Amino acid sequence: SFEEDPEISLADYWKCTSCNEMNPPLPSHCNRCWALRENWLPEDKG
Ligand SMILES: [Zn+2]
Numbered sequence: 001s002f003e004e005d006p007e008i009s010l011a012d013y014w015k016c017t018s019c020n021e022m023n024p025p026l027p028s029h030c031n032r033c034w035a036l037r038e039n040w041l042p043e044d045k046g
Contacts, residue, residue, distance in 0.1 A: 002031055
């Protein structure tokens with residue numbers, strides 16, 4: 001939901017590691033250049 005999203009906030013957004021754009025936490029992929037975040041998959045945690 002990029003167009004009007006009261007639920008999610010803009011401060012939580014992320015910067016594309018390729019094109020450097022502001023994409024919402026969901027989905028974790030640039031809606032412009034189509035690039036997934038660098039750290040999305042939950043690794044082994046203790
Ligand atoms: Zn991008």
